[PDB]
Design a protein around this ligand. Structure first.
Ligand SMILES: NC(=O)Cc1cccc(-n2[nH]c(-c3cccs3)c/c2=N\C(=O)Nc2cccc(Cl)c2Cl)c1
Length: 348
């Protein structure tokens, strides 16, 4: 057990092993806060997330267990991995705080798409890495659900990691209006159409790819309805085959009220794009989620010929998500979490 030292940072008490030096706040939110620090043991610049009251409710306790499980499992070049996890607590009785340590990310993909001039080769490499990371996440039946530029860490070498930097609740207010929180969402998830699957993430990748190509938000709707309209205008209104799959009668009924519209010519939307980019976009941005290209399928697409390597695009180890269907008490979620903290083994 290392020695821990205390330090207040924005009215938060931080109690961290001594190996973590020079803590500087980089983000705050209802679910936690993050600091940059220097890890004297590895020489790495790190991010350290302190979870805010991780066991105050059942939903909180399960969310803390969930993140930990996720993070302990992710071992891929293009996905955030866990360097360390710690608590000041000496026992389960003491246990009330959880800190997570990952590699520090300077820039997100936002601090790239704005002003920084992107070649088609850069778009190729960036999206390739997103897809390579997604293949791995989806192989474990893990769905990101919230892919967007701010959830993608990118270094000076254009190397990329998927993460989820959400410190916030994800409320109705947060999904409302002219907001980037909603711009990358698959329609079926944005509007609660049906039970969704992992292709929600492919929709997001399409929105991201478009924006990288044009330097502009693909669907910057001023609200849910306006956004739907932006979408339908590009990809066309649904036919009867798709309407059947909208299991929400009220959703179905509204979407039938709309003037029918054909799918547009993408060559005329993405003027001057590599035709292979255009092609790939048309296969990502399909209304019917059963017919979207998958991550595995898209890696083999001609657009990525320069990067694609089937012997170096690995799948995940099996991920037991049976806890998700389980009904536990706070104390039980907490002991589960405690066990996972105790048993962490750092990477090589
Ligand atoms: N969703 C929940 O209820 C649990 C829940 C709540 C909050 C975040 C997350 N997820 N999900 C993923 C994924 C990566 C790939 C596919 S999903 C990663 C992740 N956490 C971070 O990246 N943290 C993180 C981000 C920046 C700095 C530091 Cl230090 C940390 Cl720790 C799980």
């Amino acid at each position: 057990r290392p020695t821990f030292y205390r330090q207040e940072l924005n009215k938060t008490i931080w109690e961290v092993p001594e190996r973590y030096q020079n803590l500087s706040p980089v983000g705050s939110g209802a679910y936690g806060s993050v600091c940059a620090a220097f890890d004297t043991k590895t020489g790495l610049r790190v991010a350290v997330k302190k979870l805010s009251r991780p066991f105050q409710s059942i939903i909180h306790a399960k969310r803390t267990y969930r993140e930990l499980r996720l993070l302990k499992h992710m071992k891929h070049e293009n996905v955030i991995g866990l360097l360390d996890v710690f608590t000041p607590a000496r026992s389960l009785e003491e246990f009330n705080d959880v800190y997570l340590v990952t590699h520090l990310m300077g820039a997100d993909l936002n601090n790239i798409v704005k002003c920084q001039k992107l070649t088609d080769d850069h778009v190729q490499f960036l999206i390739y890495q997103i897809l390579r990371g997604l293949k791995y996440i989806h192989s474990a039946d893990i769905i990101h659900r919230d892919l967007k530029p701010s959830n993608l860490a990118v270094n000076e070498d254009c190397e990329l990691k998927i993460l989820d930097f959400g410190l916030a609740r994800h409320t109705d207010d947060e999904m409302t209006g002219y907001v980037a929180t909603r711009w990358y969402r698959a329609p079926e998830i944005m509007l609660n159409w049906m039970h969704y699957n992992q292709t929600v993430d492919i929709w997001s990748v399409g929105c991201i790819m478009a924006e990288l190509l044009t330097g502009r938000t693909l669907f910057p709707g001023t609200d849910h309805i306006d956004q739907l309209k932006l979408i339908l205008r590009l990809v066309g209104t649904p036919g009867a085959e798709l309407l059947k799959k909208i299991s929400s009668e009220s959703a179905r009924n509204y979407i039938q009220s709309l003037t029918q519209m054909p799918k547009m010519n993408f060559a005329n939307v993405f003027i001057g794009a590599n035709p292979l980019a255009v092609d790939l976009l048309e296969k990502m941005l399909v209304l019917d989620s059963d017919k979207r290209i998958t991550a595995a399928q898209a890696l083999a697409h001609a657009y990525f010929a320069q990067y694609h390597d089937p012997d170096d695009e690995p799948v995940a180890d099996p991920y037991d998500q049976s806890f998700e269907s389980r009904d536990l008490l706070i104390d039980e979620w907490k002991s589960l979490t405690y066990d996972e903290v105790i048993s962490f083994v750092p990477p090589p």
